[PDB]
Amino acid sequence: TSSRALPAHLKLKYRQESQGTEEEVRKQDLREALLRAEAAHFAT
């Protein structure tokens, strides 16, 4: 129909292994990581 409605980007991209999937975020400990990062920023 219209030029902009033609098929394009037909492959949906999913997060790969080291890109931060749900499995890793559930496995990771975000709290102590956040406090450590804040302390590292504070040290500057």
Binding site: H9, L12, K13, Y14, R15, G20, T21, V25, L30, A33
Partner: protein
């Protein structure tokens, strides 16, 4: 007539002998009013049932509040050149993105507040961001009527979603399916397929701007609140509405889902109400925020935050519905007094830091006070059993 005399005991034996402590302070003293004439066959049972209902209500409003510790300001990020309207946090809790009225999406580092790259490409104000937790994407929408899908692996727009007759005010992503839902000024919430950019469903039931949105996995999936002060619960399978929630008087500008409880809370200019989700059963009010609430966010440990249009910030005990802290937002130096306001807010993934996007061109980070000590940091006082709610 002096048919009987000596009321000395009667004027005391009636008032005294009962429960000494007041139950609901309006108890009719069940045993004391049978003796009058009338219609005990019908009227008496109705009065008894109404008393049972009222005593249950007044006793069920008396949940002891918890402590939850107070919050404080820790960081003020001032980089935007317009009102900051939206905020979303990446699932790894490393960075967060905030669109604003200067047509730009700025991506900040959550821990340090350092500004990463600035994304441009919107004609008008950005109103909603959403970082996909299963794809490396970042969807955005603005008052310029088009929806964009930024590819975070290349930082370039790849997908465009076009069908919208006016500005788009909210955007949400289905947790399980690859489907996103947008709501805007054309009084229609539209359902988009991510891959094909097609508009599968047109959730058209409202009469005015759908100012709020919420999407989840169990039915009903899409929850839309509009300027009619009405909330609708849609089913995505058929694109129809299941329930309509008209309890609100003014437009409901904030919808938010509890992470762990299968209930949701909505806010408006008058009252904040939270509902049991499967059938939309009312579950109580959060009274005390006499302002135009814009945002609602629930922590993991049953803490609610409600930000107003005049900088009013109230923290609620989710279980007991008790507003345990009042905070007044203070503007950065260049602003006016009238410029105090809050447009968007979100707890981070852990829930220990709260990010607030103000009507002040500044982003503020709030952190619970670390020392704790409920003895030295008491909440707002709780005064039980004052009177039953009007409802």
């Amino acid at each position: 007539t002096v048919r009987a005399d000596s009321e000395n005991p009667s004027s005391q034996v009636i008032t005294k002998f009962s429960d000494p402590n007041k139950k609901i302070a309006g108890q009719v003293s069940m045993q004391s009013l049978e003796k009058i004439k009338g219609v005990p066959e019908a009227a008496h049972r109705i009065a008894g049932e109404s008393q049972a209902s009222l005593v249950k209500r007044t006793l069920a409003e008396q949940i002891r509040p918890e402590w939850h510790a107070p919050w404080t300001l820790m960081r003020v990020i001032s980089g935007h050149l317009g009102w900051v309207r939206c905020v979303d946090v990446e699932p790894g809790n490393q960075w967060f993105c905030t669109g604003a009225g200067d047509r730009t999406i700025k991506i900040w580092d959550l821990a340090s507040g350092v500004l990463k790259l600035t994304l441009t490409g919107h004609i008008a104000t950005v109103r909603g961001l959403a970082v996909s937790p299963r794809h490396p994407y970042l969807f955005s929408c603005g008052e310029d009527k088009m929806v964009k899908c930024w590819d975070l692996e290349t930082n370039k727009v790849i997908r465009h979603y076009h069908g919208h007759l006016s500005g788009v005010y909210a955007l949400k992503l289905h947790p399980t399916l690859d489907v996103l839902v947008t709501a805007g000024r054309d009084a229609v919430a539209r359902v988009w397929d991510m891959r094909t950019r097609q508009n599968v469903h047109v959730l058209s039931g409202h009469k005015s701007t759908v100012a709020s949105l919420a999407v989840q996995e169990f039915d009903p999936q899409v929850v839309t609140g509009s300027m009619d002060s009405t909330i609708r619960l849609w089913d995505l399978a058929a694109g129809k509405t299941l329930t309509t929630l008209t309890h609100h008087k003014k437009t409901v500008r904030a919808l938010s889902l509890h992470p762990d409880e299968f209930t949701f809370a909505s806010g408006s200019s008058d009252n904040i109400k939270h509902w049991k989700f499967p059938e939309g059963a009312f579950m109580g009010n959060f009274e005390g925020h006499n302002a135009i609430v814009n945002t609602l966010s629930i922590n993991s440990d049953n803490v609610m935050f409600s930000g107003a249009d005049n900088g009013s910030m109230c923290f609620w005990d989710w279980k007991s519905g008790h507003k345990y802290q009042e905070l007044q937002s203070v503007v950065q130096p260049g602003s006016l007094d009238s410029e105090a306001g809050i447009f968007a807010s979100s707890f981070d993934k852990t829930g220990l830091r709260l990010i607030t996007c103000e009507a002040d061109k500044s982003v503020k980070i709030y952190k619970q006070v670390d020392n704790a000590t409920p003895e030295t940091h008491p909440n707002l006082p709780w005064t039980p059993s004052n009177l039953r709610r009007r409802y």
